[PDB]
Amino acid sequence: GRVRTKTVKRASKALIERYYPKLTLDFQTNKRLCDEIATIQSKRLRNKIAGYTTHLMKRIQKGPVRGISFKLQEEERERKDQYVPEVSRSNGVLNVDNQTSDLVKSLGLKLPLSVINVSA
Amino acid sequence: GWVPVTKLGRLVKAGKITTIEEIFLHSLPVKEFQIIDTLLPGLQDEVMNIKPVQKQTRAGQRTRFKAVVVVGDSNGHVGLGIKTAKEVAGAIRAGIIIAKLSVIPIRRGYWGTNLGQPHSLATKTTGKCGSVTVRLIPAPRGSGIVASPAVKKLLQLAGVEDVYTQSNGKTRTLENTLKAAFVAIGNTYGFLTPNLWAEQPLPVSPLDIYSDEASAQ
Amino acid sequence: MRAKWRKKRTRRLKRKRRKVRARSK
Amino acid sequence: TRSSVLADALNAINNAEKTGKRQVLIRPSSKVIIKFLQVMQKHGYIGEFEYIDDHRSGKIVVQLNGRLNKCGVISPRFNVKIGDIEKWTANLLPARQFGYVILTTSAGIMDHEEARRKHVSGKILGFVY
Amino acid sequence: VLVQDLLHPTAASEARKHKLKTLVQGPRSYFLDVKCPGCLNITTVFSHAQTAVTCESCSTILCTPTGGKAKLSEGTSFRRK
Amino acid sequence: SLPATFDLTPEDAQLLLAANTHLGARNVQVHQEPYVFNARPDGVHVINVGKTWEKLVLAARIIAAIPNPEDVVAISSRTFGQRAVLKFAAHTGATPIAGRFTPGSFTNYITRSFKEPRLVIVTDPRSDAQAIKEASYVNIPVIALTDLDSPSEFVDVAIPCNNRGKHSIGLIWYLLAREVLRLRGALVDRTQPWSIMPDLYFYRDP
Amino acid sequence: PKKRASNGRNKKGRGHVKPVRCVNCSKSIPKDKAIKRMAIRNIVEAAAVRDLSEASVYPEYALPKTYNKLHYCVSCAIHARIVRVRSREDRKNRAPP
Amino acid sequence: GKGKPRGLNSARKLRVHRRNNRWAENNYKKRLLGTAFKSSPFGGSSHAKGIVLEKLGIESKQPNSAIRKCVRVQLIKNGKKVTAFVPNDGCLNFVD
Amino acid sequence: MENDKGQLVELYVPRKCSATNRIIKADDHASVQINVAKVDEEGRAIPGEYVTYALSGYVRSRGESDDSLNRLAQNDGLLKNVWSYSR
RNA sequence: AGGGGAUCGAAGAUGAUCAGAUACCGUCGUAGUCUUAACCAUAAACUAUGCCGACUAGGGAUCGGGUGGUGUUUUUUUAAUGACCCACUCGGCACCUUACGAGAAAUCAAAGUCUUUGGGUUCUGGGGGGAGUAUGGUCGCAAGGCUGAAACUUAAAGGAAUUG
Numbered sequence A: 001g002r003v004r005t006k007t008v009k010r011a012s013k014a015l016i017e018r019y020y021p022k023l024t025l026d027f028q029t030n031k032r033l034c035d036e037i038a039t040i041q042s043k044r045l046r047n048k049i050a051g052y053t054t055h056l057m058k059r060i061q062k063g064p065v066r067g068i069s070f071k072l073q074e075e076e077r078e079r080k081d082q083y084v085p086e087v088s089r090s091n092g093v094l095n096v097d098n099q100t101s102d103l104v105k106s107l108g109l110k111l112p113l114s115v116i117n118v119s120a
Numbered sequence B: 001g002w003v004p005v006t007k008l009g010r011l012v013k014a015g016k017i018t019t020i021e022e023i024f025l026h027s028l029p030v031k032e033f034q035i036i037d038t039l040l041p042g043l044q045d046e047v048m049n050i051k052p053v054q055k056q057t058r059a060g061q062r063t064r065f066k067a068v069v070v071v072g073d074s075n076g077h078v079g080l081g082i083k084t085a086k087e088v089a090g091a092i093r094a095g096i097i098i099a100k101l102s103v104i105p106i107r108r109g110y111w112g113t114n115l116g117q118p119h120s121l122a123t124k125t126t127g128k129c130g131s132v133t134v135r136l137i138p139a140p141r142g143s144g145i146v147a148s149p150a151v152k153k154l155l156q157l158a159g160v161e162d163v164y165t166q167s168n169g170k171t172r173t174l175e176n177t178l179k180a181a182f183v184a185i186g187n188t189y190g191f192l193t194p195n196l197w198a199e200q201p202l203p204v205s206p207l208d209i210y211s212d213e214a215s216a217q
Numbered sequence C: 001m002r003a004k005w006r007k008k009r010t011r012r013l014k015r016k017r018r019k020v021r022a023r024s025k
Numbered sequence D: 001t002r003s004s005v006l007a008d009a010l011n012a013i014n015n016a017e018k019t020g021k022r023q024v025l026i027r028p029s030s031k032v033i034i035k036f037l038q039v040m041q042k043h044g045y046i047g048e049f050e051y052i053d054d055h056r057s058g059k060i061v062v063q064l065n066g067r068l069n070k071c072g073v074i075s076p077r078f079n080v081k082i083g084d085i086e087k088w089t090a091n092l093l094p095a096r097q098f099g100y101v102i103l104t105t106s107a108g109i110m111d112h113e114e115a116r117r118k119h120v121s122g123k124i125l126g127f128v129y
Numbered sequence E: 001v002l003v004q005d006l007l008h009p010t011a012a013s014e015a016r017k018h019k020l021k022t023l024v025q026g027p028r029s030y031f032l033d034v035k036c037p038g039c040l041n042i043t044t045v046f047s048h049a050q051t052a053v054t055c056e057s058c059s060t061i062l063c064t065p066t067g068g069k070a071k072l073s074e075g076t077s078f079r080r081k
Numbered sequence F: 001s002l003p004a005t006f007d008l009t010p011e012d013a014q015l016l017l018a019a020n021t022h023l024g025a026r027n028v029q030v031h032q033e034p035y036v037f038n039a040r041p042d043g044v045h046v047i048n049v050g051k052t053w054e055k056l057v058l059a060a061r062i063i064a065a066i067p068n069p070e071d072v073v074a075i076s077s078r079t080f081g082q083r084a085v086l087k088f089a090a091h092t093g094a095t096p097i098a099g100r101f102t103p104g105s106f107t108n109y110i111t112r113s114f115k116e117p118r119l120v121i122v123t124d125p126r127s128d129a130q131a132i133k134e135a136s137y138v139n140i141p142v143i144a145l146t147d148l149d150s151p152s153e154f155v156d157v158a159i160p161c162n163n164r165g166k167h168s169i170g171l172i173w174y175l176l177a178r179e180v181l182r183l184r185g186a187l188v189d190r191t192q193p194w195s196i197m198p199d200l201y202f203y204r205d206p
Numbered sequence G: 001p002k003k004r005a006s007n008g009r010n011k012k013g014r015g016h017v018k019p020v021r022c023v024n025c026s027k028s029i030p031k032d033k034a035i036k037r038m039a040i041r042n043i044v045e046a047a048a049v050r051d052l053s054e055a056s057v058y059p060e061y062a063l064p065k066t067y068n069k070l071h072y073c074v075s076c077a078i079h080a081r082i083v084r085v086r087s088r089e090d091r092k093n094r095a096p097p
Numbered sequence H: 001g002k003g004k005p006r007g008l009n010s011a012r013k014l015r016v017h018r019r020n021n022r023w024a025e026n027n028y029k030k031r032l033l034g035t036a037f038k039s040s041p042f043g044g045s046s047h048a049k050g051i052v053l054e055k056l057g058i059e060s061k062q063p064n065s066a067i068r069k070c071v072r073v074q075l076i077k078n079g080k081k082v083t084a085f086v087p088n089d090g091c092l093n094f095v096d
Numbered sequence I: 001m002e003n004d005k006g007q008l009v010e011l012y013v014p015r016k017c018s019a020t021n022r023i024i025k026a027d028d029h030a031s032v033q034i035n036v037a038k039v040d041e042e043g044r045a046i047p048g049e050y051v052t053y054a055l056s057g058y059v060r061s062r063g064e065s066d067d068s069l070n071r072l073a074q075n076d077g078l079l080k081n082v083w084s085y086s087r
Numbered sequence J: 001a002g003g004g005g006a007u008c009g010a011a012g013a014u015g016a017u018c019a020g021a022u023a024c025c026g027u028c029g030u031a032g033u034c035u036u037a038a039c040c041a042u043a044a045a046c047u048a049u050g051c052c053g054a055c056u057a058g059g060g061a062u063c064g065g066g067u068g069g070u071g072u073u074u075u076u077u078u079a080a081u082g083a084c085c086c087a088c089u090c091g092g093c094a095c096c097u098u099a100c101g102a103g104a105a106a107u108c109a110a111a112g113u114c115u116u117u118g119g120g121u122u123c124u125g126g127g128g129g130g131a132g133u134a135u136g137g138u139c140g141c142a143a144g145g146c147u148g149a150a151a152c153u154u155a156a157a158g159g160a161a162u163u164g
Ligand SMILES: [Mg+2]
Pocket: none
């Protein structure tokens, strides 16, 4: 099997967490990045890592991934945020119940009227 | 260096709260022992008991060590902490800390005359824990602590000059007995007497006052 | 031994002593 | 069968308090319940109360403040002997500085302290603190 | 719950209860003047008869006994007082 | 303390009857709600929306009243709440908890999810039961969006609405946001429909 | 100690139900404690039904199952049929599938 | 109330039942039956003086292996016969 | 809890639950203190100035936290027909 | 003591298995199993949990009774019936969820309202064996039931839960 141990997956997380600008979809440079940007004790463990931190990278591009939040998303989430122009005052009148009406008449005032009956 | 976590921890070294009485007033959940350290330094340690326990293991027989510790001044504040560890030192180390966090107030009182400085309790009180019931009775002055050596010490450390005691249960099992004698003294600032019927305006929360001088960044 | 087999054990025992004693009536 | 009409009112009062209520309705009231009810109220362990009148034995609604931990009843109305009133309070009151043992004496239902001042004694029935 | 007016219960929650568990107890049956327009006069019946109430002059019938409330017979009118 | 004009207005009521906030629960109906109002025949119970609108006001009257508007936490595990809360938080002080809560966030400093707020607002104490449970381990007031079958234990001030889905939750959260900015904060004089659309606090698709 | 609130099985307010005889070992066993099963199955079987219809008169006929209610003795009910044995909790659950 | 009569005249039942139940007390029943004076090799008395019949070598119960050294004595006020132990190292060499 | 002469001996006079007038002790880390806001004319909400209420851990556990506050705030004149003393 | 005696079947007899196999499995089958007239009076006769009264907390089912409904369905000409549906209310057999509370726990709307120890009343237990034995009394045709000790011995026996 080729399941990456935690130490690799843990480390990839930590690096994407705080170096998403820098880092790439390219392993080859992600490799070199790891040298400057982190101490590792063996060439094997580094590529093992950088390969996977590239993987995680390559698919953040296609949507978020649980476990990694470099803040830059939570604000992307708010500026990518808006909708509406229609609401739910058209058309005509609020349709209510017999007693929903009675609720109105027994506290408030102005209301377009529209009743119904319901069955067992 | 300290470095507190928790809002409340920060406020303390911030010198913006002065006594636990405050903390108790608003029932503030303590989480950081140095809070009760810098608040009440006169605290002294008493190791009450160490007894072996044994777990069987799918490859081993862990026998770690359970230590019971009581901390207090002798002026209205006790603690009861219990911890088991692989070493007795470690058990005693951790125990004192938990006993710090646990620290409660005691409501002492007068046997039955208004005279100089409360020496006994406020009411009879009962604490239970497991099978042991410990029952504390207000006693005249110079009666002393009428209780078995352990409970006599837990009481002493909370600063009780004269009480009577009575116990029901398998008292031999120290752990539960002291835990019940603990519950007993905790129950003094629960029991509502006439002298506390008068209404108080209801104080403002330290976390809202020095809100600023708490808070993270 | 099973309780009920012991209950039977001594039921018999009394019958013999019940017997031997009659001998002397 | 209903055996002590005091016992029931008292317990009701206590179960209400315990559960954080402010009012009981007790049934079925009597001269004694009232007098007992009246004695607690005199030292403020309950608010006001009302006798509602079923054309029967009665009902009572009590209003509770929360100042009350316990109101018990002494089931056989033992004789107390003016000397022995001390031994009772000691047995079953939290301290010597408050709480009352209430009892029925030749000259009225009254808490032990009043009983002391008036120099009468009699039978014992209940207590408050 | 926790604080309520036991002294002034609401007419409805009061009404739905049992005839003995109301505030002060009292019946929930009623009486009625009853006429079967063969005759002219009005005999006063109990809502929970038991006896099959024999009318005044004409031994016609009137109501029948039931579980609780009497079943009035055929063509008859009433009023609760 | 009574305001004067903070009565339930025309357009307010209209908003709530289009959200169907007044549609309370069915043959399920918690003992502890007189927030009801005459049983709708065949199932539903109708909710006194004034009582709703009033509770909402308390809600606002207590949210604003926290010195640092950010340690006023707004949680929702339910999806129909998530889109609302994030939008509630953004608009006010408040910190948001959408989706998973992660237990030991109020107990246990050590946890990286750690908080320590002065107040909690929750949308459905069934699903978010964790939060309500946790706050009671460490004295923290709680504000709740409740239905007629919600578990009122350990929540002070309910807001009797309709977590039966749709728009209600958002609607309520919006109004919540609306009144806390109106309160002590930058907003307006009279009615003033507020720029922001209520569909901004809405569950999306597909 | 005790192990089930339904003690053995299903008798609250009765004192005596009546024994049935285990379908497998003929052990007597109270009808309420009895482990039962409707053995609704076809007369034919799996793939015999093709041959059935084909070498028959009429069209398609009807085909009527056998029905017979089964009673097992616990030990039998455990030894093969419905039983397994469940966790302390999974025991509590009375839903079938 | 669980059990015991609470009433104000129920004092007779309350004593009787106590008389009754005392018998389940070991030393009360020993005392009142006079088990002392009747069984017991001594009189009921603190010590008793007898005469030495044979010298015994009683082997000890497990997990203890030893030979315990005793004397059969025949009590003088009694003729009741009794085996008794002879404490400390040697000492059996004192008797005869 | 005074003494022989004046002198307020014995520290700490605890808060009582606004709803039950029972003591709110220390390890009661499930009790709660709510601040409701003093306000002025035309919205606005006078910071630092609250009308405050305190509810015991018991009460909140029992579910009565809402209802009981409804009463308390309303008959302090800050709820307008929400509660009802009769049932 | 009569009748009955299909079935199944203590005893007994056999076939087998087994080192043995007085058994488990197979066969034969006495008594018995059923009933009448008398006995016997015991079961883990169990909820291993006295009865009467009060109080304390939520939820959906169901059983019997009753009340309310310009409810549904039955058609005939609409009712009247009947069954069904919804709300409430008494009294049942139970279950669910919680626990303020209780407990050594397992668990418990009672096993709750108990060192803050008293509603009324009945009954039984007081370390383990010895032993439900000996003895006396009594009931029984019997088998046996009820009542029921001691000497002597002994440091544990026992309960619930945990890890193995
Ligand atoms: Mg020791």
